[PDB]
From a paper:
HLA-B*57:01, HLA-B*57:03 and HLA-B*58:01 are micropolymorphic HLA allotypes of the HLA-B17 serotype. Notably, residues 97, 114 and 116 contribute to the E pocket of the antigen-binding cleft, whilst residue 116 also contributes to the F pocket.
As a consequence of these substitutions the C, D, E and F pockets of HLA-B*57:01 were the deepest and most negatively charged of the three allomorphs. In contrast, the substitution of the P9Tyr for Trp, which is more enriched at this location in ligands of both allotypes, improved the stability of both HLA-B*57:01 (+2.8 °C) and HLA-B*57:03 (+8.6 °C) complexes. We further defined a secondary anchor site that modulated peptide affinity for the HLA molecule and distinguished the HLA-B*57:01 peptide-binding motif. Arg appeared at P7 of 9mers (and PΩ-2 of longer peptides) almost exclusively in the HLA-B*57:01 data set and correlated with stabilisation of HLA-B*57:01 complexes by PΩ-2 Arg.
Residue numbers in the entry:
A (entry chain A): 1 to 276
B (entry chain B): 1 to 97
C (entry chain C): 1 to 9
Write the structure that this text describes.
Amino acid sequence: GSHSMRYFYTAMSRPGRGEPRFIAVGYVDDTQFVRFDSDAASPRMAPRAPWIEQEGPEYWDGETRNMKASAQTYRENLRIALRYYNQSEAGSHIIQVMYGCDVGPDGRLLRGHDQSAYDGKDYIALNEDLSSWTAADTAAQITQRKWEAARVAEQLRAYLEGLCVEWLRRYLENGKETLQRADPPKTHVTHHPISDHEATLRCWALGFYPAEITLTWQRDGEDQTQDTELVETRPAGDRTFQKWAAVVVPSGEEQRYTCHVQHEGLPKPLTLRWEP
Amino acid sequence: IQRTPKIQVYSRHPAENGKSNFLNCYVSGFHPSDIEVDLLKNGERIEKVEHSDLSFSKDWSFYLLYYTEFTPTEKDEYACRVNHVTLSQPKIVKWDR
Amino acid sequence: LTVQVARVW
Protein backbone atom coordinates (compact mmCIF):
# COMPACT_ATOMS: atom_id res chain seq x y z
CA GLY A 1 0.00 0.00 0.00
CA SER A 2 1.23 3.43 1.06
CA HIS A 3 4.55 4.08 2.80
CA SER A 4 6.39 6.73 4.79
CA MET A 5 9.90 7.75 5.55
CA ARG A 6 10.46 9.65 8.77
CA TYR A 7 13.53 10.97 10.56
CA PHE A 8 13.47 11.83 14.28
CA TYR A 9 16.10 14.05 15.94
CA THR A 10 16.41 14.57 19.70
CA ALA A 11 18.86 17.18 21.12
CA MET A 12 19.13 17.17 24.91
CA SER A 13 21.16 19.63 26.93
CA ARG A 14 22.82 18.64 30.24
CA PRO A 15 24.52 21.61 31.84
CA GLY A 16 27.59 20.54 33.81
CA ARG A 17 27.73 17.25 31.89
CA GLY A 18 29.24 18.38 28.59
CA GLU A 19 27.60 19.41 25.32
CA PRO A 20 24.07 18.38 24.36
CA ARG A 21 23.52 14.82 23.17
CA PHE A 22 22.12 14.57 19.62
CA ILE A 23 20.45 11.30 18.51
CA ALA A 24 18.85 10.77 15.09
CA VAL A 25 16.97 7.75 13.88
CA GLY A 26 15.41 7.05 10.49
CA TYR A 27 12.38 4.83 9.75
CA VAL A 28 10.64 3.50 6.66
CA ASP A 29 7.14 2.74 7.94
CA ASP A 30 7.69 0.91 11.26
CA THR A 31 11.20 -0.32 10.39
CA GLN A 32 14.17 1.60 11.78
CA PHE A 33 17.03 1.68 9.26
CA VAL A 34 19.67 4.16 10.51
CA ARG A 35 20.87 5.78 13.71
CA PHE A 36 23.38 8.49 14.77
CA ASP A 37 24.27 9.08 18.44
CA SER A 38 26.68 11.87 19.31
CA ASP A 39 27.56 9.99 22.54
CA ALA A 40 28.84 6.90 20.72
CA ALA A 41 32.56 6.17 21.07
CA SER A 42 32.75 6.87 17.34
CA PRO A 43 29.63 8.79 16.14
CA ARG A 44 28.53 7.97 12.60
CA MET A 45 25.31 7.25 10.76
CA ALA A 46 25.08 3.47 11.14
CA PRO A 47 22.83 0.80 9.56
CA ARG A 48 20.00 -0.74 11.51
CA ALA A 49 18.32 -2.76 8.73
CA PRO A 50 19.98 -5.22 6.33
CA TRP A 51 18.68 -3.54 3.15
CA ILE A 52 20.45 -0.24 3.90
CA GLU A 53 23.82 -1.97 4.26
CA GLN A 54 24.40 -2.03 0.50
CA GLU A 55 24.72 1.75 0.36
CA GLY A 56 28.32 2.69 -0.27
CA PRO A 57 30.95 4.76 1.56
CA GLU A 58 29.75 7.98 -0.10
CA TYR A 59 26.31 7.47 1.44
CA TRP A 60 27.61 6.74 4.95
CA ASP A 61 30.19 9.49 4.93
CA GLY A 62 27.63 11.97 3.59
CA GLU A 63 25.04 11.05 6.22
CA THR A 64 27.64 11.12 8.99
CA ARG A 65 28.81 14.59 7.95
CA ASN A 66 25.24 15.83 7.78
CA MET A 67 24.41 14.42 11.21
CA LYS A 68 27.47 16.07 12.75
CA ALA A 69 26.48 19.38 11.14
CA SER A 70 22.93 18.88 12.44
CA ALA A 71 24.17 18.15 15.94
CA GLN A 72 26.06 21.46 15.88
CA THR A 73 22.98 23.30 14.59
CA TYR A 74 20.74 21.85 17.33
CA ARG A 75 23.25 22.57 20.12
CA GLU A 76 23.11 26.18 18.98
CA ASN A 77 19.28 26.06 18.76
CA LEU A 78 19.16 24.92 22.39
CA ARG A 79 21.15 28.06 23.36
CA ILE A 80 18.85 30.24 21.23
CA ALA A 81 15.74 28.71 22.82
CA LEU A 82 17.09 29.50 26.25
CA ARG A 83 17.10 33.13 25.22
CA TYR A 84 13.65 33.03 23.63
CA TYR A 85 11.99 31.68 26.80
CA ASN A 86 14.09 33.67 29.30
CA GLN A 87 15.44 30.46 30.83
CA SER A 88 18.51 29.91 33.00
CA GLU A 89 21.61 28.03 31.86
CA ALA A 90 21.18 25.54 34.71
CA GLY A 91 18.30 23.43 33.35
CA SER A 92 18.18 20.53 30.92
CA HIS A 93 15.99 21.06 27.84
CA ILE A 94 15.09 19.08 24.73
CA ILE A 95 14.49 19.95 21.08
CA GLN A 96 12.81 17.33 18.91
CA VAL A 97 12.25 17.32 15.17
CA MET A 98 10.40 14.87 12.97
CA TYR A 99 10.16 15.13 9.22
CA GLY A 100 9.59 13.00 6.17
CA CYS A 101 7.33 12.09 3.30
CA ASP A 102 4.36 9.82 2.64
CA VAL A 103 3.83 8.15 -0.74
CA GLY A 104 0.93 6.18 -2.23
CA PRO A 105 1.06 2.73 -3.89
CA ASP A 106 2.19 4.40 -7.11
CA GLY A 107 5.10 6.08 -5.33
CA ARG A 108 3.64 9.58 -5.71
CA LEU A 109 3.95 12.14 -2.88
CA LEU A 110 0.85 12.00 -0.71
CA ARG A 111 2.18 14.61 1.69
CA GLY A 112 5.27 16.00 3.44
CA HIS A 113 5.92 16.63 7.14
CA ASP A 114 8.28 18.76 9.20
CA GLN A 115 7.50 19.55 12.82
CA SER A 116 9.65 20.70 15.77
CA ALA A 117 9.10 20.80 19.54
CA TYR A 118 10.76 22.36 22.56
CA ASP A 119 10.49 20.56 25.92
CA GLY A 120 7.86 18.22 24.50
CA LYS A 121 5.52 20.98 23.32
CA ASP A 122 4.79 22.00 19.72
CA TYR A 123 7.19 24.76 18.66
CA ILE A 124 6.91 25.20 14.87
CA ALA A 125 5.47 23.10 12.07
CA LEU A 126 5.59 23.25 8.28
CA ASN A 127 2.00 23.37 7.02
CA GLU A 128 0.68 20.76 4.52
CA ASP A 129 1.19 23.29 1.70
CA LEU A 130 4.95 23.03 2.31
CA SER A 131 5.13 26.81 1.95
CA SER A 132 3.94 28.33 5.23
CA TRP A 133 4.49 27.74 8.96
CA THR A 134 2.43 27.35 12.12
CA ALA A 135 4.27 28.74 15.15
CA ALA A 136 3.01 27.69 18.54
CA ASP A 137 3.94 30.78 20.59
CA THR A 138 5.75 34.16 20.32
CA ALA A 139 9.22 32.58 20.52
CA ALA A 140 8.45 30.32 17.59
CA GLN A 141 7.17 33.36 15.74
CA ILE A 142 10.68 34.75 15.99
CA THR A 143 11.95 31.56 14.36
CA GLN A 144 9.17 31.76 11.72
CA ARG A 145 10.26 35.26 10.74
CA LYS A 146 13.84 34.04 10.37
CA TRP A 147 12.80 31.06 8.24
CA GLU A 148 10.52 33.14 6.06
CA ALA A 149 13.35 35.60 5.47
CA ALA A 150 15.65 32.69 4.52
CA ARG A 151 13.10 30.80 2.38
CA VAL A 152 13.51 27.64 4.49
CA ALA A 153 10.06 26.39 3.42
CA GLU A 154 11.12 26.42 -0.25
CA GLN A 155 14.18 24.33 0.56
CA LEU A 156 12.19 21.77 2.52
CA ARG A 157 9.57 21.59 -0.12
CA ALA A 158 12.29 20.87 -2.68
CA TYR A 159 13.59 18.12 -0.42
CA LEU A 160 10.21 16.61 0.44
CA GLU A 161 9.07 16.47 -3.17
CA GLY A 162 12.45 15.44 -4.54
CA LEU A 163 15.12 13.51 -2.67
CA CYS A 164 12.75 12.37 0.08
CA VAL A 165 10.40 10.56 -2.28
CA GLU A 166 13.21 9.32 -4.53
CA TRP A 167 15.17 7.80 -1.66
CA LEU A 168 12.07 6.35 -0.06
CA ARG A 169 11.23 4.63 -3.37
CA ARG A 170 14.79 3.32 -3.54
CA TYR A 171 14.62 1.93 0.01
CA LEU A 172 11.22 0.34 -0.71
CA GLU A 173 12.74 -1.47 -3.71
CA ASN A 174 15.95 -2.55 -1.96
CA GLY A 175 13.98 -3.78 1.04
CA LYS A 176 10.91 -5.05 -0.80
CA GLU A 177 11.05 -8.51 0.81
CA THR A 178 10.27 -6.94 4.19
CA LEU A 179 9.12 -3.35 3.75
CA GLN A 180 6.51 -4.50 1.22
CA ARG A 181 5.38 -7.53 3.17
CA ALA A 182 2.53 -7.31 5.65
CA ASP A 183 2.45 -10.06 8.27
CA PRO A 184 -1.04 -10.64 9.59
CA PRO A 185 -1.71 -11.01 13.27
CA LYS A 186 -2.03 -14.41 14.92
CA THR A 187 -5.13 -14.01 17.06
CA HIS A 188 -6.76 -15.75 20.00
CA VAL A 189 -9.16 -15.08 22.89
CA THR A 190 -8.41 -15.96 26.52
CA HIS A 191 -10.93 -16.15 29.37
CA HIS A 192 -10.22 -15.71 33.04
CA PRO A 193 -12.79 -15.50 35.84
CA ILE A 194 -12.19 -12.64 38.23
CA SER A 195 -15.10 -13.67 40.47
CA ASP A 196 -18.12 -15.99 40.50
CA HIS A 197 -20.07 -13.53 38.32
CA GLU A 198 -17.58 -11.75 36.01
CA ALA A 199 -14.79 -12.85 33.68
CA THR A 200 -12.17 -11.10 31.59
CA LEU A 201 -12.11 -11.86 27.90
CA ARG A 202 -8.87 -10.78 26.30
CA CYS A 203 -8.43 -10.65 22.53
CA TRP A 204 -4.77 -11.06 21.48
CA ALA A 205 -2.95 -10.11 18.27
CA LEU A 206 0.69 -11.23 17.92
CA GLY A 207 3.37 -11.24 15.26
CA PHE A 208 1.93 -8.57 12.97
CA TYR A 209 3.58 -5.94 10.76
CA PRO A 210 3.08 -3.07 10.24
CA ALA A 211 2.07 -1.75 13.66
CA GLU A 212 -1.28 -0.29 12.63
CA ILE A 213 -4.13 -2.53 13.80
CA THR A 214 -7.67 -2.22 15.12
CA LEU A 215 -8.94 -4.53 17.86
CA THR A 216 -12.49 -3.94 19.07
CA TRP A 217 -14.93 -5.82 21.30
CA GLN A 218 -18.64 -5.90 20.45
CA ARG A 219 -21.42 -7.02 22.80
CA ASP A 220 -24.53 -8.08 20.91
CA GLY A 221 -23.00 -6.36 17.88
CA GLU A 222 -22.37 -2.98 19.53
CA ASP A 223 -18.84 -1.61 20.03
CA GLN A 224 -17.77 -1.55 23.67
CA THR A 225 -15.32 1.34 23.26
CA GLN A 226 -15.82 2.89 26.67
CA ASP A 227 -15.68 -0.47 28.41
CA THR A 228 -12.64 -1.93 26.63
CA GLU A 229 -9.12 -1.90 28.09
CA LEU A 230 -6.71 -1.47 25.19
CA VAL A 231 -2.91 -1.71 25.74
CA GLU A 232 -0.51 0.25 23.56
CA THR A 233 0.77 -1.65 20.53
CA ARG A 234 4.19 -2.92 21.57
CA PRO A 235 7.23 -4.22 19.67
CA ALA A 236 8.18 -7.89 19.99
CA GLY A 237 11.79 -7.27 19.01
CA ASP A 238 11.73 -9.36 15.81
CA ARG A 239 10.17 -6.53 13.77
CA THR A 240 6.62 -7.52 14.63
CA PHE A 241 4.15 -6.01 17.08
CA GLN A 242 1.68 -7.19 19.67
CA LYS A 243 -1.52 -5.81 21.15
CA TRP A 244 -4.48 -6.87 23.20
CA ALA A 245 -7.97 -5.67 24.10
CA ALA A 246 -9.89 -6.78 27.19
CA VAL A 247 -13.43 -6.53 28.45
CA VAL A 248 -15.05 -7.62 31.72
CA VAL A 249 -18.23 -9.55 31.07
CA PRO A 250 -20.95 -11.11 33.17
CA SER A 251 -20.40 -14.83 33.71
CA GLY A 252 -22.62 -16.79 31.35
CA GLU A 253 -22.69 -13.99 28.77
CA GLU A 254 -19.34 -14.70 27.10
CA GLN A 255 -20.87 -15.74 23.79
CA ARG A 256 -22.51 -12.34 23.36
CA TYR A 257 -19.07 -10.83 22.91
CA THR A 258 -17.03 -10.88 19.69
CA CYS A 259 -13.58 -9.47 18.98
CA HIS A 260 -13.00 -7.82 15.64
CA VAL A 261 -9.56 -7.47 14.08
CA GLN A 262 -8.55 -5.25 11.19
CA HIS A 263 -5.03 -5.38 9.79
CA GLU A 264 -3.45 -4.71 6.39
CA GLY A 265 -2.22 -8.32 6.31
CA LEU A 266 -5.79 -9.63 6.47
CA PRO A 267 -7.88 -9.96 3.24
CA LYS A 268 -10.96 -9.27 5.40
CA PRO A 269 -11.59 -8.26 9.02
CA LEU A 270 -11.57 -11.18 11.46
CA THR A 271 -14.29 -11.95 13.98
CA LEU A 272 -13.40 -14.23 16.85
CA ARG A 273 -14.96 -15.42 20.08
CA TRP A 274 -13.94 -17.26 23.18
CA GLU A 275 -13.79 -20.98 22.41
CA PRO A 276 -14.09 -22.93 25.68
CA ILE B 1 5.94 19.76 31.45
CA GLN B 2 6.71 16.12 32.45
CA ARG B 3 5.12 12.77 31.54
CA THR B 4 5.44 9.53 33.46
CA PRO B 5 6.34 6.29 31.65
CA LYS B 6 3.90 3.58 30.74
CA ILE B 7 5.46 0.20 31.28
CA GLN B 8 4.77 -3.20 29.76
CA VAL B 9 6.66 -6.38 30.55
CA TYR B 10 6.17 -9.33 28.25
CA SER B 11 7.91 -11.96 26.15
CA ARG B 12 8.78 -11.98 22.45
CA HIS B 13 7.07 -15.37 21.96
CA PRO B 14 4.37 -17.01 24.14
CA ALA B 15 6.31 -18.49 27.04
CA GLU B 16 7.12 -22.20 27.31
CA ASN B 17 9.17 -23.40 30.32
CA GLY B 18 12.64 -24.55 29.25
CA LYS B 19 12.41 -22.88 25.83
CA SER B 20 14.61 -19.89 24.96
CA ASN B 21 12.76 -16.58 24.54
CA PHE B 22 13.20 -12.82 24.95
CA LEU B 23 12.07 -10.80 27.95
CA ASN B 24 10.96 -7.27 27.03
CA CYS B 25 10.26 -4.15 29.00
CA TYR B 26 8.70 -1.47 26.81
CA VAL B 27 8.65 1.98 28.31
CA SER B 28 6.71 4.68 26.49
CA GLY B 29 4.83 7.95 26.78
CA PHE B 30 7.46 9.60 28.93
CA HIS B 31 9.18 12.99 28.88
CA PRO B 32 11.96 13.95 29.42
CA SER B 33 14.05 11.18 27.90
CA ASP B 34 16.40 10.22 30.75
CA ILE B 35 15.12 6.98 32.22
CA GLU B 36 16.58 4.07 34.17
CA VAL B 37 15.34 0.60 33.32
CA ASP B 38 16.48 -2.72 34.77
CA LEU B 39 15.20 -6.22 34.14
CA LEU B 40 14.99 -8.34 37.32
CA LYS B 41 15.28 -12.12 37.73
CA ASN B 42 14.09 -13.10 41.22
CA GLY B 43 14.54 -9.51 42.37
CA GLU B 44 18.11 -9.30 41.06
CA ARG B 45 19.34 -7.13 38.18
CA ILE B 46 20.10 -8.95 34.94
CA GLU B 47 23.42 -7.89 33.39
CA LYS B 48 24.04 -6.49 29.91
CA VAL B 49 20.38 -5.98 28.92
CA GLU B 50 20.14 -4.37 25.43
CA HIS B 51 17.90 -1.49 24.41
CA SER B 52 16.57 0.17 21.28
CA ASP B 53 17.66 3.56 19.95
CA LEU B 54 15.78 6.48 21.50
CA SER B 55 12.84 7.58 19.41
CA PHE B 56 9.52 9.28 20.02
CA SER B 57 5.82 9.24 19.09
CA LYS B 58 3.72 11.88 17.27
CA ASP B 59 2.92 13.47 20.66
CA TRP B 60 6.68 13.90 21.31
CA SER B 61 6.72 11.34 24.12
CA PHE B 62 9.64 8.91 24.13
CA TYR B 63 9.77 5.14 23.85
CA LEU B 64 12.43 2.47 24.43
CA LEU B 65 12.45 -1.33 24.35
CA TYR B 66 14.81 -3.06 26.82
CA TYR B 67 15.29 -6.77 26.23
CA THR B 68 17.35 -9.77 27.15
CA GLU B 69 17.48 -13.44 26.23
CA PHE B 70 15.94 -15.73 28.86
CA THR B 71 14.68 -19.26 29.43
CA PRO B 72 11.55 -19.12 31.57
CA THR B 73 10.85 -21.78 34.19
CA GLU B 74 7.92 -22.37 36.56
CA LYS B 75 9.94 -21.10 39.51
CA ASP B 76 11.73 -17.96 38.26
CA GLU B 77 10.06 -14.56 38.70
CA TYR B 78 10.79 -11.74 36.27
CA ALA B 79 10.12 -8.03 36.54
CA CYS B 80 11.00 -4.67 35.09
CA ARG B 81 12.11 -1.81 37.35
CA VAL B 82 11.81 1.73 36.08
CA ASN B 83 12.93 5.07 37.45
CA HIS B 84 12.17 8.48 35.97
CA VAL B 85 12.13 12.06 37.26
CA THR B 86 8.30 11.82 37.53
CA LEU B 87 8.58 8.83 39.88
CA SER B 88 9.17 9.28 43.63
CA GLN B 89 10.64 5.77 43.81
CA PRO B 90 11.35 3.02 41.26
CA LYS B 91 8.25 1.34 39.87
CA ILE B 92 8.31 -2.45 39.61
CA VAL B 93 6.08 -4.24 37.13
CA LYS B 94 6.04 -8.03 37.33
CA TRP B 95 6.02 -10.23 34.23
CA ASP B 96 2.64 -11.99 34.06
CA ARG B 97 2.58 -14.63 31.30
CA LEU C 1 18.50 10.19 3.03
CA THR C 2 18.42 13.09 5.48
CA VAL C 3 17.65 16.70 4.62
CA GLN C 4 20.53 19.18 4.34
CA VAL C 5 19.02 22.52 5.15
CA ALA C 6 20.25 24.99 7.78
CA ARG C 7 17.62 25.45 10.46
CA VAL C 8 18.92 28.06 12.88
CA TRP C 9 16.14 28.98 15.33
